[PDB]
Amino acid sequence: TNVYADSFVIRGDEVRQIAPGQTGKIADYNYKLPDDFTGCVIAWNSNNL
Amino acid sequence: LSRLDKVEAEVQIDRLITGRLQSLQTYVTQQLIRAAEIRASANLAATKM
């Protein structure tokens, strides 16, 4: 019906925090996936930029 | 709830709930069956009475 595309840049270690229902700094105080999230997490490196 | 972060603790509490919630139906079903015996014995009394 209606999608929300939201993006940001995080570290290569903390991206495993980027799982809904997990802990760690990015999911604790920065950006929070919900308790029931069906969204897809797309992640890649942009080290050359 | 104290030890574990909720996202995993959800699955744990299931095994409690599923266990306990089942354990009620066991108890309830027993009472139904057992009451149906008393219900039969009650009529025997009401018949004698």
Tab-separated table of C-alpha atoms in Angstrom:
chain	number	residue	atom	x	y	z
A	1	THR	CA	0.000	0.000	0.000
A	2	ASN	CA	2.600	2.529	1.144
A	3	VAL	CA	6.302	2.005	1.620
A	4	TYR	CA	8.775	3.931	3.733
A	5	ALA	CA	12.269	4.117	2.293
A	6	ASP	CA	14.636	5.475	4.926
A	7	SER	CA	18.403	5.401	4.648
A	8	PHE	CA	21.515	6.267	6.630
A	9	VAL	CA	25.216	5.427	6.974
A	10	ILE	CA	26.634	3.336	9.824
A	11	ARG	CA	29.788	1.381	10.594
A	12	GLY	CA	30.759	-2.008	9.244
A	13	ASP	CA	30.747	-3.539	12.715
A	14	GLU	CA	27.492	-2.127	14.081
A	15	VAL	CA	25.308	-3.259	11.163
A	16	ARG	CA	24.427	-6.494	12.953
A	17	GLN	CA	22.770	-4.213	15.499
A	18	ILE	CA	20.577	-3.173	12.504
A	19	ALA	CA	18.245	-6.181	13.150
A	20	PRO	CA	14.682	-5.524	14.485
A	21	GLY	CA	14.417	-6.390	18.219
A	22	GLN	CA	18.173	-6.309	18.847
A	23	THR	CA	20.278	-4.052	21.052
A	24	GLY	CA	23.395	-1.979	20.615
A	25	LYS	CA	23.897	1.711	20.077
A	26	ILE	CA	22.352	2.271	16.646
A	27	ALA	CA	19.264	0.345	17.636
A	28	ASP	CA	19.319	1.763	21.144
A	29	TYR	CA	19.454	5.515	20.689
A	30	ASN	CA	19.818	6.211	16.959
A	31	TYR	CA	17.311	4.282	14.821
A	32	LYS	CA	14.814	1.704	16.004
A	33	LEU	CA	13.297	-1.135	14.039
A	34	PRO	CA	9.929	-2.092	15.562
A	35	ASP	CA	8.881	-5.232	17.401
A	36	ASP	CA	6.957	-6.429	14.302
A	37	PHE	CA	8.857	-5.238	11.160
A	38	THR	CA	8.467	-6.849	7.674
A	39	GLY	CA	10.901	-4.371	6.005
A	40	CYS	CA	14.060	-5.493	4.111
A	41	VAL	CA	17.505	-4.316	5.286
A	42	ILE	CA	19.775	-3.490	2.398
A	43	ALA	CA	23.389	-2.933	3.309
A	44	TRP	CA	26.579	-2.411	1.352
A	45	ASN	CA	29.950	-0.743	1.617
A	46	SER	CA	30.683	2.671	0.205
A	47	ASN	CA	34.339	2.838	1.264
A	48	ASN	CA	35.480	4.368	-2.032
A	49	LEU	CA	33.193	7.386	-1.500
B	1	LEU	CA	12.163	-11.004	31.303
B	2	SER	CA	14.964	-9.978	33.653
B	3	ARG	CA	17.845	-11.944	32.167
B	4	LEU	CA	17.059	-11.833	28.473
B	5	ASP	CA	16.296	-9.048	26.068
B	6	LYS	CA	12.617	-9.390	25.094
B	7	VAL	CA	13.060	-10.310	21.398
B	8	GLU	CA	14.424	-13.698	22.387
B	9	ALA	CA	12.461	-13.856	25.643
B	10	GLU	CA	9.327	-13.878	23.490
B	11	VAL	CA	10.129	-17.380	22.268
B	12	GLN	CA	10.915	-18.482	25.813
B	13	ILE	CA	7.644	-17.251	27.299
B	14	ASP	CA	5.840	-19.207	24.592
B	15	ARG	CA	7.154	-22.450	26.044
B	16	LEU	CA	5.844	-21.271	29.400
B	17	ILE	CA	2.515	-20.134	27.987
B	18	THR	CA	2.113	-23.072	25.621
B	19	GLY	CA	3.005	-25.297	28.532
B	20	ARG	CA	0.817	-23.581	31.104
B	21	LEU	CA	-2.042	-22.773	28.739
B	22	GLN	CA	-2.089	-26.427	27.784
B	23	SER	CA	-1.831	-27.365	31.449
B	24	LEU	CA	-5.091	-25.540	32.076
B	25	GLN	CA	-6.943	-27.365	29.318
B	26	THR	CA	-5.757	-30.568	30.933
B	27	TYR	CA	-7.150	-29.417	34.268
B	28	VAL	CA	-10.316	-28.007	32.728
B	29	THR	CA	-10.992	-31.142	30.721
B	30	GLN	CA	-10.537	-33.230	33.849
B	31	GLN	CA	-13.072	-31.126	35.727
B	32	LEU	CA	-15.570	-31.361	32.873
B	33	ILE	CA	-15.208	-35.130	32.773
B	34	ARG	CA	-15.223	-35.420	36.544
B	35	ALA	CA	-18.223	-33.119	36.879
B	36	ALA	CA	-20.060	-35.215	34.311
B	37	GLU	CA	-19.614	-38.118	36.703
B	38	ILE	CA	-20.948	-36.104	39.629
B	39	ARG	CA	-23.728	-34.883	37.351
B	40	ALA	CA	-24.594	-38.544	36.887
B	41	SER	CA	-24.288	-39.268	40.594
B	42	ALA	CA	-26.409	-36.222	41.404
B	43	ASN	CA	-29.295	-37.573	39.335
B	44	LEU	CA	-28.939	-40.889	41.124
B	45	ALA	CA	-29.447	-39.010	44.376
B	46	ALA	CA	-32.275	-36.876	43.008
B	47	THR	CA	-33.793	-40.119	41.785
B	48	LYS	CA	-33.463	-41.775	45.182
B	49	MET	CA	-34.512	-38.618	47.008
